Amino acid sequence: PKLSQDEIDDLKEVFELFDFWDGRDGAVDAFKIGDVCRCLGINPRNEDVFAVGGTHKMGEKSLPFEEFLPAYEGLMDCEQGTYADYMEAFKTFDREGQGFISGAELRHVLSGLGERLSDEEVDEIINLTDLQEDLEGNVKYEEFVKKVMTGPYPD
Amino acid sequence: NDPDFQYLAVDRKKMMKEQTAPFDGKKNCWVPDPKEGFASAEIQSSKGEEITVKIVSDNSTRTVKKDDIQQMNPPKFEKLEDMANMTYLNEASVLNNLRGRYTAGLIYTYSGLFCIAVNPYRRLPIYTDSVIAKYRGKRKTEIPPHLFSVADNAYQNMVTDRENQSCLITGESGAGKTESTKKVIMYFARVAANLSNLEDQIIEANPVLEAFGNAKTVRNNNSSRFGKFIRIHFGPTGKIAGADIETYLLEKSRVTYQQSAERNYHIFYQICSNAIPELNEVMLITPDSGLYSFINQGCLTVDNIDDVEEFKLCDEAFDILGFTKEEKTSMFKCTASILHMGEMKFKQRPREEQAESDGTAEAEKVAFLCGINAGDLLKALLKPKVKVGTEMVTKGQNLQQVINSVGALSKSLYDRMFNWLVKRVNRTLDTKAKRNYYIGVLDIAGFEIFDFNSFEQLCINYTNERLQQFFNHHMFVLEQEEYKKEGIQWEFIDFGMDLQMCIDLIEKPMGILSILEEECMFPKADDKSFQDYSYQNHIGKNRMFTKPGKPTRPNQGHAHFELHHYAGNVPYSIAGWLDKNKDPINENVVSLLAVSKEPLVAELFRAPDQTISAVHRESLNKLMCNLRRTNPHFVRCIIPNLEKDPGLVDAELVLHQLQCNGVLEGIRICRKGFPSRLIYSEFKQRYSILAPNAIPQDGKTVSEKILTGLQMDPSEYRLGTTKVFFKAGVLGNLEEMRDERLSKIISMFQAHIRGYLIRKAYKKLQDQRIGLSVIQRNIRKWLVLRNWQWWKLYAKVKPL
Amino acid sequence: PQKQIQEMKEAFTMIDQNRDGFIDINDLKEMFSSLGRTPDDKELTAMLKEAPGPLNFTMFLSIFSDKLSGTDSEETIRNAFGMFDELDTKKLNIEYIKDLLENMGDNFNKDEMRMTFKEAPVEGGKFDYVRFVAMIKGSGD
Ligand SMILES: Nc1ncnc2c1ncn2[C@@H]1O[C@H](COP(=O)(O)OP(=O)(O)O)[C@@H](O)[C@H]1O
Ligand SMILES: [Ca+2]
Ligand SMILES: [Mg+2]
Ligand SMILES: [Mg+2]
């Protein structure tokens, strides 16, 4: 909840770069709060960001860096899913139990349930990760689940 | 995919296309409604014990306390085949699922051991020979709810298990228990037929029985006015071998009295049909029903009743049964005479105190048909001859009196006759052949409360009371042997509990019935003498016996004391109970008929080696000994409305029946243990997403881990050796808990993806900043430079 | 800067008709004329005054390089533009670049905007950043 210089310094650079991408003036748009903290390694949910200040659309409220700390910190205390949390969930959509699931289902799960992902947000991640649909039309969710948790730059 | 499954199973896929409104276990529920019993609704706001809702139908607003609201079932539970599987099992949920399947053609629904049958009020393709072929040897669970399944399983249970079976059928009037009984019988005949016959003769027995046993009432146009227990005997190869019938409480008062728009027994309107004129003389009757006072009081016709065809058929009925012309006729004779007895008139002196007949045509026609002397008859009917010790005296009849002894004669004669009739039929059906096992079929009125209740009501209710205690006892054993069978165990009592006290108040030594019995052998006994002791021996001492309370419904008639039956506090009036129990009948007239010339009459009035309540209580203990020595099966008949319209449902009515039916009672009973259960295998698949960080990656193990993981309350559950036992409503919670958790985990994975996207782009944003930085910097220069009076002029010196 | 500095000497000398080795009020004042509307008092001093004292070349250079000082090359500026055309199409969409310039980074205002796109080479909705670069530097017109 309470940061060290190391942490506080990184937030600054990130906050900096974002402040620039919407007019350099020491303020960041309330709508990019989520996207700012994501760049710091946290994985907030839209309800989390809305609970600390975030807004629905651009141009409604701007926040100085001095109003971020409170926000950022609060956002570090939410729940981050774990490998198990995810696997079990996908397991519920898997009949047979041999770790499979229809591509359509996958896409269904991603944009239909929970705080939906946009269709463009989805086909973007499938490319980056390279989710290869097997002959029949299904996939191995185990992989997709690791890759997403593994990150873009994979160690 | 068959037509044989048209009115049996709805559509698994089409029901899955019930894709309109979603479901929030948090917002949808049931609420008290005057018109529809309950009312679907959405919770809006809360203020302690003040829940405000909006009705899906009229989108209005009403306020209801949090305690009157009842749980609602998710969509996947629509038209459920066994209501014992429902997450939430309650009043509003049972009402709804039944109404549900009904408005969809299905009339058969399970609910534990119970098989509910709602009157379709329209013949259906369900009972065909093709259908039967499908239910043969199929367990209950592997096929659409069907009465054929209750019967078949009673059968497969009979062979295999080598034990007596019994199938009890109850409900209100017009619920359709009589016609279901027929169906259970027709089913065996068609599955265990030896290879006219007995099967047939059993069918023929209904016509004659219904001839004297049934009548037209405002409720049913063919209401059986007596209770009947039928036992079908089978031989060592499982083939029908014999059968017998038992009867209970014939409604005698009807024989001489009809309420408006009601008729006496059918038989009277058949012998008055003139379908067989050649008999008109042997009976001495004129083909006009509205001519005799004992049957011309209410109405005379029935829509779906052809009194002429039916008389014809019953006449045929006695032949297939093997009745001699002599017997058959005796029947019509003794029956006809009751019509004339009501036509006998009497002259009351001017201002005095003794009576004398007024004509003889009636008194003669009677004596003729009765095989006695009309002078004798009118002499004993007028001024009798009693039987006082060592010196019998002469008793004087007033007016009235006489009238009361004529009706009492009819009543008493019709009863004796009817009893004879049943015993005769048994004679036929009893093929002296070895029987190993049997299967009985009960069919009596159910527990019923009215505006006004009397001695007749107490009897009925007192039977079902004993009969309900029998069910709770079957339930109790089954449950015990179930809990013990899975290693868990049992901690406690028996469901025949508060049933006993109520039953004891009635049938034990110094209880109600007992005092009525003792208070009858006293001449100067008053309706108050009776009220007096029954207050003395019980009010202020019994819990199950209290004083009248505040009227529950409109028109609550009068009452003297309240009885706490298992279906509620019923208000009784003991007015006249002393007259309704003992039957006054000329000890003199009896002796004369005793010596009658017609074999029947003589046999009807002989001696042996007595009273009502005493009779019934004896035949009841018999019935019970018998039932307590079989494997029960229950069918609960429910009448949908008071208009005989198909598909129409009346909430207050159905709810009422369920209250006294035994289905609600069998839910509260089951609640006491652990109702909903699951086999470890499913539990894990269903609730692993409730404690994933505790799973290794057995079956009972995982489960023990999830349960202990959620800090589950010890009482709330129990652990069997194959499945896990839960209290009622537990799994409902584990169900919402599973909705939020799947929801957030998903949201959370979406949140991980959003981060992965921005983290990847992060590098381009960094570079693109220096690039836009560049462009802005430079374009601004060329925008400066080309205006610097210096430069604009400097480049004007290089054109060399 | 190579031919850059070198050239200055060449410009420097023209920038002086007397050769007194310095650019006085006159030297500039009497070349310019050899061309057009010799400025108004306000302009000339304003100009020369940009220099604390007498123009010792070293002062010419320092002021001129001080002005450009912050510029970049052609291949550079056109590479910056090329960071927004991931496809390498050699052109950007007009509305895209008009938004990049006006609402992000160090936002242009309705003026800097009008001035920038007045002579912008824009065919069919496509802003040819390659030309525009030649236009600003001088490699073209
Ligand atoms: N299974 C059924 N199929 C068609 N009609 C039925 C069925 N069950 C009951 N009924 C209706 O109910 C009446 C018979 O009721 P019963 O006499 O069978 O009711 P209860 O046994 O309560 O006195 C008939 O007039 C008939 O229209
Ligand atoms: Ca900003
Ligand atoms: Mg009946
Ligand atoms: Mg000079």
- How does DSSP assign B154-210, residue by residue? HHHHHHHHT--EEEEEEESTTSSHHHHHHHHHHHHHTTS-----HHHHHHHHHHHHH
Domain C1-69 in CATH 1.10.238.10? The answer is: yes
Residues 6+ apart with CB under 8 A from B701: none
How far apart (Å, rounded) are the C-alpha atoms in residues B430 and B428?
Answer: 5
How far is residue B93 from each of residues B25, B619, B656, measured CA to CA in Å? Answer: 14, 38, 15
Task: Write down the residue that tokens 């925008």 correspond to.
Answer: B783
Resolution in A: 3.1
Token couple for B191: 């599955």
How far apart (Å, rounded) are the C-alpha atoms in residues C81 and C91?
Answer: 9
Token couple for B289: 């029903």
How far apart (Å, rounded) are the C-alpha atoms in residues A109 and B5?
Answer: 36
How far apart (Å, rounded) are the C-alpha atoms in residues B143 and B134?
Answer: 9
Q: How many Å separate Cα B739 from the centre of its chain? A: 38
How far apart (Å, rounded) are the C-alpha atoms in residues B544 and B538?
Answer: 9
**Of B404, B288, B279, whose CA–CA distance to B339 is shortest?**
B288
DSSP assignment of B653-687 equals HHHHHHHHHSTTHHHHHHHTS---EEEHHHHHHHH
- Asked if the domains C1-69 and C70-137 are classified in one and the same CATH topology, the answer is yes
**Of B268, B247, B248, B245, whose CA–CA distance to B256 is shortest?**
B268
Token couple for B534: 């029954």
How far apart (Å, rounded) are the C-alpha atoms in residues B652 and B657?
Answer: 9
* Ligand 1, atom 9, residue with closest C-alpha: B176
**With contacts defined as CB-CB under 8 Å, which chain A residues touch C106?**
24
How far apart (Å, rounded) are the C-alpha atoms in residues B255 and B294?
Answer: 7
**With contacts defined as CB-CB under 8 Å, which chain B residues touch C84?**
768, 771-772
Q: How many Å separate Cα B10 from the centre of its chain? A: 24
List chains touching C (3+ CB pairs under 8 A): A, B
Round the CA-based radius of gyration of chain C to a whole number and report it: 20
Sign of CA dihedral B556, B560, B566, B568: positive
Question: Which chain A residue has the Cα nearest residue C99?
Answer: A22
Instruction: Tell me the residue type at B383.
Output: K
Q: Residue B543: how many CB atoms within 10 A of its CB?
A: 10
Sheet holding C92-93, edge to edge: C92-93, C126-127, C122-123
Q: Are B188 and B444 in contact (CB under 8 A)?
A: no
How far apart (Å, rounded) are the C-alpha atoms in residues B118 and B99?
Answer: 9
**E strand or H helix that includes residue B555:** none
Token couple for C57: 């070349």
How far apart (Å, rounded) are the C-alpha atoms in residues C120 and C81?
Answer: 14
Ligand 2 center to C132 CA (angstroms): 28
Residues 6+ apart with CB under 8 A from C70: B777, B781
CA angle B175, B180, B185 (to 5 degrees): 160
How far apart (Å, rounded) are the C-alpha atoms in residues B569 and B555?
Answer: 16
- Rounded to 5 degrees, φ, ψ at B781 are -70, -65
**With contacts defined as CB-CB under 8 Å, which chain A residues touch B692?**
82, 84-85, 87-88
CA-based nearest distance B750→chain C, Å: 27
Q: How many Å separate Cα B404 from the centre of its chain? A: 37
Residues 6+ apart with CB under 8 A from B557: B450, B451, B452, B453, B571, B573
How far apart (Å, rounded) are the C-alpha atoms in residues B272 and B448?
Answer: 34
**Of B398, B359, B361, whose CA–CA distance to B381 is shortest?**
B398
Bridge partners of residue A27, in order along the sequence: A64
Q: Are B369 and B334 in contact (CB under 8 A)?
A: yes
Architecture of domain A3-80: Orthogonal Bundle (1.10)
Using CB distances shorter than 6 Å, the residues near ligand 1 are: B 119-121, 123, 171-179, 220-224, 637
- Rounded to 5 degrees, φ, ψ at B353 are -130, 35
Interchain CB distance below 8 Å, A24 and C103: no
Ligand 1 center to B208 CA (angstroms): 18
Q: Is B582 left (phi over 0), alpha (psi -120 to 50) or beta?
A: beta
DSSP assignment of B86-140 equals -SS-SHHHHHHHHHHHHTTT--EEEETTEEEEE--SS--GGG-HHHHHHHTT--S
**Of B246, B238, B133, B254, whose CA–CA distance to B192 is shortest?**
B238
- Say how many Å lie between the first and final Cα of chain C, rounded: 23
Token couple for B79: 């038209």
How far apart (Å, rounded) are the C-alpha atoms in residues B176 and B636?
Answer: 10
CA-based nearest distance A151→chain B, Å: 6
Pairing of strands B41-46, B165-171: unpaired
Using CB atoms within 10 A of its CB, is residue C2 exposed (0-12), middle (13-18) or buried (19+)? exposed
**E strand or H helix that includes residue B243:** strand B240-248
Q: Residue B134: how many CB atoms within 10 A of its CB?
A: 16
CA angle B658, B660, B661 (to 5 degrees): 55
DSSP annotation of B37 reads E
CATH 1.10.238.10: which residues of chain A? 3-80, 81-152
How far apart (Å, rounded) are the C-alpha atoms in residues B176 and B170?
Answer: 9
How far apart (Å, rounded) are the C-alpha atoms in residues B591 and A3?
Answer: 114
Using CB atoms within 10 A of its CB, is residue B302 exposed (0-12), middle (13-18) or buried (19+)? middle
Could you please state the CATH topology (level 3) that the domain comprising A81-152 is classified under. Recoverin; domain 1 (1.10.238)
Q: Are B748 and A43 in contact (CB under 8 A)?
A: yes
CA-based nearest distance C102→chain A, Å: 9
Sheet holding B568-572, edge to edge: B545-546, B561-565, B568-572
Token couple for B486: 């899975």
Q: Are C22 and C55 in contact (CB under 8 A)?
A: yes
Q: Are C141 and C135 in contact (CB under 8 A)?
A: yes
Task: Write down the residue that tokens 């065996």 correspond to.
Answer: B188
Homologous superfamily (CATH) of C70-137 is EF-hand (1.10.238.10)
CA-CA-CA-CA dihedral for B388, B393, B395, B396, to nearest 10: -160
Whether A83 has its CB under 8 Å from any CB of chain B: the answer is no
Q: How many Å separate Cα B455 from the centre of its chain? A: 22
Instruction: Tell me the residue type at B233.
Output: H
Token couple for A29: 């748009």
Long-range CB contact pairs, B272-281, < 8 A, 24+: B272/B307, B272/B339, B273/B307, B273/B308, B273/B310, B273/B311, B274/B308, B275/B307, B275/B308, B275/B309, B275/B311, B275/B312, B275/B315, B276/B311, B276/B312, B276/B315, B279/B329, B279/B332
Q: Are B699 and B681 in contact (CB under 8 A)?
A: yes
Residues 6+ apart with CB under 8 A from B695: A84, A88, B688, B702, B705, B706
Interchain CB distance below 8 Å, B781 and C68: yes
Whether A26 has its CB under 8 Å from any CB of chain C: the answer is no
Q: Residue B703: how many CB atoms within 10 A of its CB?
A: 24
- Rounded to 5 degrees, φ, ψ at B116 are -85, 135
Q: Which residues of B are catalytic?
A: 173-174, 178, 220, 223-224, 446, 448
**Of B736, B751, B743, B27, whose CA–CA distance to A113 is shortest?**
B743
Bridge partners of residue B62, in order along the sequence: B53
Total beta-carbon pairs less than 8 A apart between chain A and chain B: 107
Long-range CB contact pairs, B36-41, < 8 A, 24+: B36/B651, B37/B92, B37/B95, B37/B651, B37/B652, B37/B654, B37/B655, B38/B70, B38/B91, B38/B92, B38/B95, B38/B96, B38/B651, B40/B72
Interchain CB distance below 8 Å, B775 and C116: no
**E strand or H helix that includes residue B590:** helix B587-594
Question: Which chain A residue has the Cα nearest residue C108?
Answer: A23
Q: Which method was used?
A: X-ray
Domain borders along chain C are 1-69, 70-137
Sign of CA dihedral B165, B459, B637, B301: positive
Q: How many Å separate Cα B216 from the centre of its chain? A: 21
Token couple for C16: 């002086």
Measured in residues, chain B has a length of 800
Q: Residue B289: how many CB atoms within 10 A of its CB?
A: 21
Q: Are B366 and B374 in contact (CB under 8 A)?
A: yes
Alpha helix (H) residue ranges in B385-454: 400-429
Pairing of strands B61-64, B51-54: antiparallel
**Of C105, C97, B142, whose CA–CA distance to A25 is shortest?**
C105
B704-716: b or e for each residue (b if 16 or more CB lie within 10 Å)? Answer: bbbbebeebeeee
Of A20, A87, A92, the CB nearest to B769: A20
**With contacts defined as CB-CB under 8 Å, which chain C residues touch B771?**
79-81, 83-84
Residues 6+ apart with CB under 8 A from B779: C101, C116, C136
- Say how many Å lie between the first and final Cα of chain A, rounded: 27
Measured in residues, chain A has a length of 155
B631-664: b or e for each residue (b if 16 or more CB lie within 10 Å)? Answer: bbbbbbbbbbbeeeeeeebbbebbbbbbbbbbbb
Helix%, strand%, coil% for chain C, nearest 5: 55, 5, 40
Q: Is B715 left (phi over 0), alpha (psi -120 to 50) or beta?
A: alpha
**B685, B737, B747, B764, best to mutate vs chain A, most A CBs in 10 Å:** B747
